C-alpha cells in the first residue's frame with residue numbers, strides 16, 4: 309500500500325545513493341577529523357524506526373543520553389535538476405551512566421514522518437489505525453529491499469521499537485556487532 | 486495508489502517546508518548576489534513533470550537552451566534527527582535565439598524518478614504501463630494538495646508535458662504570469 313511506495317522511495321532516493329559511499333566518509337571523519345582521543349565512529353548507519361511514527365526532529369531532545377557530536381563530510385550529487393544536492397548525516401554519542409558508551413551515525417526514517425502527517429491531513433484519507441499497519445509494512449518492505457541489495461552489505465542496521473531508554477536500545481544494537 | 490503516497494510525501498517533506506520561505510531566498514539572491522545587470526530571478530519555483538518519468542539529473546543536458554546559472558542561498562533545518570539538513574535549489578537561464586530570455590528556479594520532481602526506478606525493479610512489482618497512470622495520478626494529487634494550501638499561494642507553478650523544446654515549454658509558463 310502507501311508504505312510500499314514510501315519504502316522503495318526511501319531505498320531508491322537515499323539509501324541506494326549514500327550507503328555505497330558512507331564508509332569512506334566515516335573513515336575520513338575518524339582519521340582526519342575525529343578527536344584524537346575519542347574512539348572511532350562505527351562503520352554502519354543506524355536507522356531508527358518508531359512504529360508509532362513519532363519522529364522528533366532533534367534526536368538529543370528525544371533522549372538526554374543521546375546528544376549531537378558532529379556531522380560527517382556532506383555528500384553532494386546532481387539530482388533531478390538540482391546541482392550539488394547535499395546529503396548530510398549527524399554523528400551522535402550514547403551515554404551510559406553519564407560516560408560516553410558509543411558513537412555512531414544515527415537518524416530517524418523520515419518517511420515515517422510523512423505517514424504521520426498523512427494521518428493528520430483530511431485530504432490524505434489516512435487513518436491513525438491505518439498508520440500503525442503502514443508503519444510495520446514500511447519496515448518489512450525496507451527489510452526485503454535490503455535483504456538482496458548491493459549497498460546494504462554491512463552498511464545499514466535497522467532499529468525498530470514500540471513504546472508501551474532509546475539510548476540503551478541503540479546501544480543494544482551496536483554491541484551485537 | 487503509489488502516486489498518492491508519493492504526492493503527499495512530496496508536499497509534506499519538501500514543498501510545505503521550502504515554499505513558505507522561498508521568496509526571501511530569491512530576494513536575497515536578486516539583491517545581494519545577482520549580477521547587477523542580469524535582471525531578476527522570478528519569485529516562483531517551477532517544477533517539471535515529465536509524464537514519461539524521464540528525469541535526467543542535469544537539466545542543462547536535457548536542453549541546450551537551458552543551462553545552470555547559480556544556486557540560491559541554501560535552506561537548512563533539523564529534520565528527523567539530521568542536524569542542518571540542506572535543502573538546495575538551482576537557478577537556470579532559458580535561451581531563445583541564443584539570447585537569455587528568462588531566469589528562474591527550475592527543477593524536476595524527484596518522486597517521478599522513484600516511480601521510474603520502481604518500474605525497473607523486479608521486487609517492486611511495478612509495470613511500465615502502471616507507471617504512466619501513476620505519473621498522471623501523482624500530478625493530479627499534487628494539484629489537489631496545492632489547490633488548498635497555505636504555502637502555494639503564488640509560489641509554485643507545475644509544468645507537465647508529454648513528448649510525442651523544453652526551454653520554450655518553460656518559457657511559455659513564465660510569460661503567462
Ligand SMILES: Nc1ncnc2c1ncn2[C@@H]1O[C@@H]2CO[P@@](=O)(S)O[C@@H]3[C@H](F)[C@@H](CO[P@@](=O)(S)O[C@H]2[C@H]1F)C[C@H]3n1cnc2c(=O)[nH]cnc21
Nearest residue numbers: 317318321322395418419422495498499572573595596599
Ligand atoms: N538528503 C537526505 N537526507 C535524508 N533522507 C533523504 C535525503 N534525500 C532523500 N532522502 C530520503 O529519500 C526519500 C525520497 O527522496 P527523493 O529523492 S524521491 O526526493 C525527496 C522526496 F521526494 C520528498 C522528501 O520526502 P522524504 O524526506 S519523507 O523522503 C525522502 C527521504 F526519506 C521530496 C524530495 N526532497 C527532499 N529534500 C530534497 C532536496 O533537498 N532536494 C530535492 N528533493 C528533495
